[PDB]
Amino acid sequence: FANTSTLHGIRHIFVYGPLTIRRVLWAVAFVGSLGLLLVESSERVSYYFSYQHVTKVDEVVAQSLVFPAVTLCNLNGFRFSRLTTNDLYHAGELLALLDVNLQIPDPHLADPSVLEALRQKANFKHYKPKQFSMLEFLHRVGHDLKDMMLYCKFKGQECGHQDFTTVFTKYGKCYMFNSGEDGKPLLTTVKGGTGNGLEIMLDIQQDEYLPIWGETEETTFEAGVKVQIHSQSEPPFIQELGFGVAPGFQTFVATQEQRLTYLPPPWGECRLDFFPVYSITACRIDCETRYIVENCNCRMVHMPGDAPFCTPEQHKECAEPALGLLAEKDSNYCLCRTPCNLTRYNKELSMVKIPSKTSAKYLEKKFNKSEKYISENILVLDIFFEALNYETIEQKKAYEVAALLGDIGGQMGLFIGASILTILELFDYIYELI
Amino acid sequence: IQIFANTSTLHGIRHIFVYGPLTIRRVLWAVAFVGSLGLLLVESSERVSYYFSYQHVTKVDEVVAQSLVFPAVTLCNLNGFRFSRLTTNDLYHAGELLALLDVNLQIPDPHLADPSVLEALRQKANFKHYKPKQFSMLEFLHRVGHDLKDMMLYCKFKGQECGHQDFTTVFTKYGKCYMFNSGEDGKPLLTTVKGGTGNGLEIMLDIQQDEYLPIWGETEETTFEAGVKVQIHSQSEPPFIQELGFGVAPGFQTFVATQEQRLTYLPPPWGECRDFFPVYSITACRIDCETRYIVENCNCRMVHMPGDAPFCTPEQHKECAEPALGLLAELCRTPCNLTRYNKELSMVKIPSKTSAKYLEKKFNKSEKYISENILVLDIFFEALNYETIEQKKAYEVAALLGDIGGQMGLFIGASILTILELFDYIYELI
Amino acid sequence: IFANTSTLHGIRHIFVYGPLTIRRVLWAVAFVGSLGLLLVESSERVSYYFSYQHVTKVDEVVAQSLVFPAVTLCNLNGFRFSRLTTNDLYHAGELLALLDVNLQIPDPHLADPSVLEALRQKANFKHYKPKQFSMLEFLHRVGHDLKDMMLYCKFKGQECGHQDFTTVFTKYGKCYMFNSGEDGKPLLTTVKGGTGNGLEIMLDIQQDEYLPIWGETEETTFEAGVKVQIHSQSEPPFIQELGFGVAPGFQTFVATQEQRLTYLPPPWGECRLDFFPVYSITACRIDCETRYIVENCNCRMVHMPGDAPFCTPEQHKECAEPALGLLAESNYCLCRTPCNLTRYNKELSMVKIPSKTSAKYLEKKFNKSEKYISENILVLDIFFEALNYETIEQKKAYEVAALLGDIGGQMGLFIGASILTILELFDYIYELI
């Protein structure tokens, strides 16, 4: 009888009278309903714990964008003219100007003019060496922006090498525009188009490039600059993320601000010894640095730390094969996950010829250079925003707990009419039968 | 006086054994219910809070098509005025503008000029006893601006021949430009039906680099560059090549592999989408905006602007409208439907060795000229499909109900009516 | 034997049945009202469910290695002039546009002197007995040779060779595909970003083997370089359409990202082959071309698969070329997206080759003029910008379990009804009859 009596209950049961009946279908109809509720409620919980996301892509008109950092590097790291005898001593083998015995490799195939200058400076049989510092070396021999930069406009106003910042990188002594160093307030763009961005004309000084001759294992046949457009929060990794600019063209880099937002685990993979602010580039440098200061007790020039600078002795026989080993052989010493908030810059590249006929003469005059030189050494580079807007890409949580309840809640309502309390009511009644 | 005690409402739909007459260890129900009620209020708030946050999410498809509508291609020589075709009257008014003449109407630094250039400017600039004649910046530009008839050596579309009669004059901050497949004259828009370089627009251009205005001596100008600018753009939008154009260089076949993008944005409260032009565009408004500010503060309009205003004379251009724009830059939101075109650029060299001679012959031009003046330009669809990017409303009212509905079901077993039932019963107690 | 008044056992929410009529008939409206909305809103939800929407899930994933794609590359020139034989000029002569319909040099007075000399040497058919000719054997022999064309190949810093590429015929002629996977060895992988650790090849395009053009030809073949498709090893190259140009006199950098698209079948999306085991849009579009030509032309072209017979230049001209011309204009061919697939997104940048200080080295090493080097040599770097793939998935918007939870909660809200509540009522109406 008690069962008959518990049918003031909230779950839905005509399965308890005094006499057995016609209506045993309710037994099935209820067991049926209960079945589905359990099937479908599982799915919803299963899915909830799958901790999915979905993507929200907007594009937002803006009154101004913050102009990014532009790092740029000559493909040539060391000017030939500026190599000293002391330099050719330590760095000689490194720059591939000298064989292991400190002597000019295949003298008969060398440029006459090159061999003249190397014979003058590389007589090491009797040489008493002097102290040498890879950083001091690079600072002195690396291409000079003062020399390289023929003009600089930003938003149509004049600029100069005083708006750039020396920044060492696997390419040597490089220059970063709008770096923000010394907390100077970052430059901003206020109009789209080629006109109102960064515009620089460069002489890449192609006749200071290290010479290549004879039976060399070298393939450094290329001339121009590498360039990374990158947010001021992240260091340049121009090694990998650079794009080429070629001489004899005005290259247009039309850019858009991208504002990524990622979710932490368990939805996504969101979330440093040497850098205050975290970056993928930042970690991957910090990682490189830590593994070399460990296995080589020096650091390279582009790395941070207070460690001692890797001598060309070390660079050759230690640190270069150490990186050779880091990538291909040894799983990441540090694998580096995405930051949560971050800003990317999307580039479209187009080009027009420089110089035109009607300017060729002017340029030859102004700069005291041959028609040839201008046409194999000069480029113009425009970085600029296509229009005043950023794109937002956010990862949004797919199914939060409140929505799970509303779904299991409505599913219960549909099949049984049950609440939490309905179940409690039943458990109370079974605990009373014991 | 004759109404049910609380005890008596066990007819009530909420889930309550809190009204047996004498007190019991089962005060937990009071907790369990107040507990359940608490969460219901917490969780139902969240859902309403969220609803009114009027979020969206994004739906990205890519759709195979039997045919795409081919876009509008506007193209401009980097040079706005051919030197050969400058007249003495032109050099009079426009002289200072083109930076061929100082504030007085004479050649700035004749000693540094090309010999041949100075000869030709002396021939045409004798102004001490010249009585000026009528001058019109539009008529000027129409006449001196590069001619497509001259510039265009061949035109294919879908492999079939084309001509300057498939293009339309269009003035822009670059001068007299030309727009392919413009749709003007209500002619039915060209369509592509096969991918690849072959079956798009293909044009060979001579940019006439030796008609470029010369620059010499102690000039502040830096127009050192040669080639064309190009905007690929939907026929409903005007070109804004000043900002959105991409460069093409001479001495290369430049390939522009394109995809149709079909953006759909939501109005407020979810997203931010919503007179001189029939159709609204961001470019359209930004022109309308520039025009209104210049016709106000300068009583003229420039050549590329619309309106019925009077064309800005070089007098005005110098002293008024140029610094007016200098002042202007120093809120136009997205249309709801719109079509974008995504470009990938690649290049090959022109001319090849085995055709260099042929081209020199056919066009009566130097080996040098061909190599510093000729380009080929292919605009074409990579394959027959458009990408759709739609903003979809995140949480509609029907789904809010289903969630607050099921939350009530879960914690209380309440309906709307359940609450009404309770309010009826309290109104009866008063 | 149950009373309307007496169904107070009923689960939907009803104060509407006493014995006498009352001021509280509002319940009748409030209920009919509630029932109204329930029907309005529950329709919307079902309507929407059957609208079978989706939404998009975009992640980006760090990886310790990416699989390097397939690179197919083609010289713009399909046939080296030097290597054209007398037999070849006989059958293929008209095809290569070297000879008019009467097997004679078209406008000899406008021809390059040196060209005409070499065509006269090879195209005097006065006494010639023709021999067996095969467009495939022809193309295999005359088409540019990678051995010749490829001056060096690096991958991940280590050396490479023509034996890491695979001959692959295409609308452009005899082309070469890197990391094709055909050798049943495991596909090559990148483990560091940047220019250095991708494919890097230096090519001499042999611009002076290009077929010459002279006199009154209707032509656009003025251009020199290579076309290149970066593509999934699962898909054949369709370089005719999907290729990008590389120009001589530049190191061209192709920075790529792996994209991993997932699409939904009907009814949500348009997801999901005689001649190809693996399905591709490219794959079916070839299979489609092939089927239509073997039907309407009884041959196949060289790039097509099948067991059909190869189209002779006779056939190629007068049959199969206009047959494809007729496929254009407007598709007799429906080729939908695969479900899983991998795309490669390319950014192109360039620097000059050669530098001044290497120009002479290259001239010497390769025994070539300053001019030749500068109009024939290019370097091509394909590589991943950084170790990650982008995932774009189409995700079902509203599955059946979520429809129930919504119709369920809507019923709960307006009526307090379950499935059983309605059954309960139908039982009670079947009992009234």
PDB file of C-alpha atoms in Angstrom, chain A residues 12 29 50 61 77 81 104 109 144 150 171 177 191 197 281 334 337-338 345-346 351 359 370 381 383 387 402 405 420:
ATOM      1  CA  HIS A  12       4.112  11.304 -12.734  1.00  0.00           C
ATOM      2  CA  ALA A  29       5.404   5.090 -20.848  1.00  0.00           C
ATOM      3  CA  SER A  50      33.689  18.529 -23.291  1.00  0.00           C
ATOM      4  CA  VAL A  61      35.822  51.242 -36.704  1.00  0.00           C
ATOM      5  CA  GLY A  77      75.578  41.695 -40.835  1.00  0.00           C
ATOM      6  CA  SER A  81      85.474  47.969 -45.496  1.00  0.00           C
ATOM      7  CA  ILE A 104      92.543  33.377 -47.463  1.00  0.00           C
ATOM      8  CA  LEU A 109      89.412  32.986 -57.616  1.00  0.00           C
ATOM      9  CA  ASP A 144      74.720  52.016 -39.833  1.00  0.00           C
ATOM     10  CA  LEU A 150      68.082  58.349 -47.036  1.00  0.00           C
ATOM     11  CA  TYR A 171      70.798  38.977 -38.269  1.00  0.00           C
ATOM     12  CA  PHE A 177      60.877  52.003 -35.126  1.00  0.00           C
ATOM     13  CA  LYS A 191      44.301  58.083 -41.565  1.00  0.00           C
ATOM     14  CA  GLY A 197      52.174  55.455 -42.389  1.00  0.00           C
ATOM     15  CA  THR A 281      58.579  34.931 -29.263  1.00  0.00           C
ATOM     16  CA  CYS A 334      60.327  24.720 -23.214  1.00  0.00           C
ATOM     17  CA  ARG A 337      51.696  28.214 -25.289  1.00  0.00           C
ATOM     18  CA  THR A 338      49.631  31.283 -26.499  1.00  0.00           C
ATOM     19  CA  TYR A 345      49.325  42.504 -37.640  1.00  0.00           C
ATOM     20  CA  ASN A 346      48.125  41.107 -41.027  1.00  0.00           C
ATOM     21  CA  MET A 351      55.135  46.905 -55.259  1.00  0.00           C
ATOM     22  CA  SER A 359      63.554  60.811 -60.997  1.00  0.00           C
ATOM     23  CA  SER A 370      75.744  55.688 -60.497  1.00  0.00           C
ATOM     24  CA  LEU A 381      59.190  50.787 -47.685  1.00  0.00           C
ATOM     25  CA  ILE A 383      54.078  50.247 -43.546  1.00  0.00           C
ATOM     26  CA  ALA A 387      41.785  51.830 -42.875  1.00  0.00           C
ATOM     27  CA  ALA A 402      23.549  27.959 -15.896  1.00  0.00           C
ATOM     28  CA  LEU A 405      20.839  23.394 -15.647  1.00  0.00           C
ATOM     29  CA  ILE A 420      15.709  18.356  -7.498  1.00  0.00           C
TER      30      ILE A 420
END
